[PDB]
């Protein structure tokens, strides 16, 4: 079954060989990809810098929702305390 081993080595060597032969036009592709990434990061439209800014925004706003709900609860707490204390003062003054 060494034929399988020969096939696989031939294919991997084929990949190495193709890359080395095309190695000069498989190197301007890299550099155009890189130059466009650079010029698109400099503007803001980069497909990856525009996909994580939106998560940093999706996580900033849950913050403010939590802040507002918490302030609502805080005010409810203060009101409950104020109401109880006023009731106690008046009622027990009259009892006295």
């Amino acid at each position: 079954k060494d034929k399988r081993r020969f096939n696989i080595e031939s294919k991997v060597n084929k990949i190495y060989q193709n890359f080395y032969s095309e190695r000069d036009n498989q190197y301007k592709d890299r550099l155009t990809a890189l130059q466009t990434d650079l010029t698109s990061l400099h503007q803001g439209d980069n497909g990856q810098y525009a996909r994580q800014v939106r998560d940093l925004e999706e996580e900033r706003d849950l913050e403010l929702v939590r802040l507002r709900l918490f302030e609502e609860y805080r005010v409810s707490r203060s009101g409950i305390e104020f109401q109880e204390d006023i009731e106690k003062a008046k009622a027990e003054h009259e009892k006295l």
């Binding site: 696989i8 990949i15 929702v65």
Partner: protein, 130 residues
């Protein structure tokens, strides 16, 4: 103390109190694509050039409520736009379907794997689709 609640509590503590070995951390199935970091999902959808929107992470999905409906995120993700993200389950189902239907036969899956593993440290190598 009634021969039922006893072993009930016993099972509870025997299942929740362990030595936190990394060998017992619950691992998800490989076919359930919702448990995939949501950057794997975006890279899959972006590589096979599928036609979906991006997903709502988890903060953008709990941001949806009558109070949350007044934040910039809701009003930028729910009005009439094309970038309207969606729930992770939808994108994950699209990805799962394109995974179970598009298919592969070896003789080119393996040699590519070997060339990839043997060149991990290399910056200049064969990009197997890019």
């Amino acid at each position: 103390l009634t021969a039922a609640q006893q072993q009930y509590i016993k099972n509870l503590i025997e299942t929740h109190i362990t030595d936190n070995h990394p060998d017992l951390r619950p691992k998800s199935h490989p076919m359930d694509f919702e448990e995939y970091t949501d950057a794997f999902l975006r890279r899959y959808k972006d590589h096979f050039q599928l036609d979906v929107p991006d997903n709502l992470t988890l903060q953008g999905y709990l941001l949806g409520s009558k109070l949350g409906a007044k934040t910039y995120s809701y009003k930028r993700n729910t009005q009439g736009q094309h970038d309207k993200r969606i729930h992770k389950r939808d994108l994950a189902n699209v990805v799962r379907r394109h995974f179970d239907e598009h298919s592969i036969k070896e003789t080119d899956c393996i040699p590519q794997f070997i060339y990839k593993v043997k060149n991990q440290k290399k910056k200049f190598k064969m990009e197997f689709r890019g």
